[PDB]
Amino acid sequence: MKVYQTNEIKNIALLGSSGSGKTTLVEAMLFESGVIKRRGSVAAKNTVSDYFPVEQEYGYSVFSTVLHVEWNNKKLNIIDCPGSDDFVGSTVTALNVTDTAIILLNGQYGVEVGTQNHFRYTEKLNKPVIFLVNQLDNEKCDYDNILEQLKEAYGSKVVPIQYPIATGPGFNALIDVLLMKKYSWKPEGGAPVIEDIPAEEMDKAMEMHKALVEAAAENDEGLMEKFFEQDSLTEDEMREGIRKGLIARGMFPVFCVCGGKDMGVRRLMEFLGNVVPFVSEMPKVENTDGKEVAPDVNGPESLYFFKTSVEPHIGEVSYFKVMSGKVREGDDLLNADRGSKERIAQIYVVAGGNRVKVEELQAGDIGAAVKLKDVKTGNTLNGKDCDYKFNFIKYPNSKYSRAIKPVNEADVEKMMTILNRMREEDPTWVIEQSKELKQTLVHGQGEFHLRTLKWRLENNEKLQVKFEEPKIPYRETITKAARADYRHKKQSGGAGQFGEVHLIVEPYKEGMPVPDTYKFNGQEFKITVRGTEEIPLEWGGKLVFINSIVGGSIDARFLPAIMKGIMSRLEQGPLTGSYARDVRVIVYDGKMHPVDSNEISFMLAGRNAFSEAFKNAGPKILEPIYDVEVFVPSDRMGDVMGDLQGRRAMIMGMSSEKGFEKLVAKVPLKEMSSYSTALSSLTGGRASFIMKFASYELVPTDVQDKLIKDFEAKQTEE
Ligand SMILES: Nc1nc2c(ncn2[C@@H]2O[C@H](COP(=O)(O)OP(=O)(O)OP(=O)(O)O)[C@@H](O)[C@H]2O)c(=O)[nH]1
Ligand SMILES: [Mg+2]
């Protein structure tokens, strides 16, 4: 409730591999700061962070939780990312908002594949990294090995700050380097018995202290001058280097903490409030107009909303971060996107699932608000003097897609509303409503990511849903030139409705002009350029209606009747009932009755004539393909290439980058239906791929035959 200044706040986001001790460490930090009363164990299913229903039934974190700990004149805006693999949507969301990332390492395991994955996100976003070793009570541990495992993984910038005397359940003291003191503890935990380093470990402290002061010296030019003068920095002069070094991204500290037994948590909270990048020194964020927005406390107020947790039995809560300015209760704010004139009734400060009414949130601090009208994720709310509108968080591309569908076709509207709300909760649940496919597409990050969406629908809102294979957008085309003739006449009403049009059909490709000669069955037809028209279609492709009526043999105003007739049959498609594309149509000769021919006469004449041109020509089916850039380790490069060779892929590139590689391919979309599941199995969760549409190409005939037989099988049900 106590209003915190700009210099007294600081943003941290917890990262690390799954099952490393992030949620449990959060519980200890809140307990030692007095936010909660008694610790709740993850087995007891009463933790502060994992307060969601789905997040409890699994037993591990699903949604990152925003929460704070009050310490000595410093407030920490900790965000506890889930740390899994299929929930990286919330990891990038929290890592853009925050200003420093702490990576947790499991002592028993060491540097897992989850640790490697998250550290790549920090490199992408240029965020500080502090390595934090946890779970030191497991006997299957060796702190020397953990640094040894990590020393080659990342550069020599890594320097330790603490080391335990000995691991195992008997661990109750760890020798520090930053404060040159040994911190003993009791089995209950929470009571740091500060005590000067013993004689045996006195030898081990100096060289790392010499190493530690050396690491912080090079970070700042001024501190290097102090190194020459005094040859040693004791407490605070070397603390400034870590501030700049983390900004410089050239110093990764290593810690020790037992989150299970609350050993070092008080020391951990003291460190972060002591030396991390400030909200001011962190590289300023810029809005969509290029203005380098700075964390100015006195500037205009601007709310950025990034999380919209709608956890049941509490209500819709929309978290926000203030990029600049300050927020008083009962202020006036304008929605940058679709301005609804929102008035924040009362702001809140959030500590997991528990909120406390507060009267002010200075710039660069995370907050919360409840019961808003028209605020969605990504909407920026700001004052009337400035029209700031932020868009700087780019989520990773989709990696797995299924078409959701209710068990009964009566709750479709309800399922639309729920999915929209959950897309608001997690923006990575990309939903596209394709009219051509006539299906509700759900996009995520893997097979497991969409299963979590299913579970929330099944339990929280009591709606049954199922995931089905998504339809494929197929396009028709033709191979070789051909033609046909057709004539029409009907004398059941008034006029004869006479219509006869001879037209030539051939594929259209850019760069090749139309010839004036066509060899059809040992006969010659003359084509002249009377009209060059290329109408785009709403479903992609092109249509060319080159006309060659000889000087006015047929009426020169009756062409539009054929125009709508062709597209009527072009939309359907004879081979598979799908849209066609890239066809150049040549119309030259026809027979026209002087008075009995109207628009409907030629519309039917053109339509039926065009329909029969395909089966005399060569029809084909086009399969969309996606450019794929698989980031794969060198160890499993061979197995990944083989699988692509089973996907009818095309090897195009081979990039040797660090320990990993980078593979380029053009894999058909149908073969990419379930690749994220398959790629993880082959590699072991150490690879990622990116899809990118690259137009339609043809298919081998065996694929073509499979489609046509299935197409008629559905029609037989009538
Ligand atoms: N041996 C040992 N185990 C611990 C310690 N602290 C926590 N654990 C266990 O480690 C497990 C890891 O659980 P979490 O910390 O909740 O997992 P997380 O950090 O939220 O990451 P996710 O599993 O992806 O959600 C928990 O079930 C704890 O029981 C510890 O100090 N020593
Ligand atoms: Mg977790």
Short mmCIF file of C-alpha atoms in Angstrom, two decimals, residues 44 57 65 128 143 158 247 250 253 270 283 313 353 357 418 440 459 472 481 507 586 638 646 662 713:
data_model
loop_
_atom_site.label_atom_id
_atom_site.label_comp_id
_atom_site.label_asym_id
_atom_site.label_seq_id
_atom_site.Cartn_x
_atom_site.Cartn_y
_atom_site.Cartn_z
CA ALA A 44 -0.20 -29.13 -0.60
CA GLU A 57 -4.30 -30.07 -11.32
CA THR A 65 1.95 -14.79 -12.21
CA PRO A 128 20.42 -9.20 -18.29
CA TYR A 143 28.34 -27.25 -7.29
CA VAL A 158 30.21 -16.19 -15.75
CA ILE A 247 23.30 -3.64 -19.01
CA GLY A 250 28.90 -9.14 -20.10
CA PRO A 253 26.58 -14.04 -11.71
CA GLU A 270 18.57 -8.43 -0.55
CA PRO A 283 17.29 0.73 -22.84
CA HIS A 313 -14.02 -17.13 -8.58
CA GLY A 353 -4.09 -13.88 -6.33
CA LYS A 357 -5.72 -1.17 -2.85
CA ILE A 418 -14.87 -18.32 -24.47
CA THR A 440 -12.47 -22.52 -36.62
CA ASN A 459 -13.47 -27.97 -16.65
CA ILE A 472 -6.06 -27.66 -46.54
CA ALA A 481 -3.19 -25.34 -73.76
CA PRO A 507 -2.09 -21.32 -68.22
CA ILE A 586 -8.53 -16.46 -75.24
CA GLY A 638 21.29 -36.28 -39.76
CA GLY A 646 9.98 -38.31 -45.73
CA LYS A 662 20.14 -24.08 -39.35
CA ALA A 713 -16.20 -40.58 -51.43
#
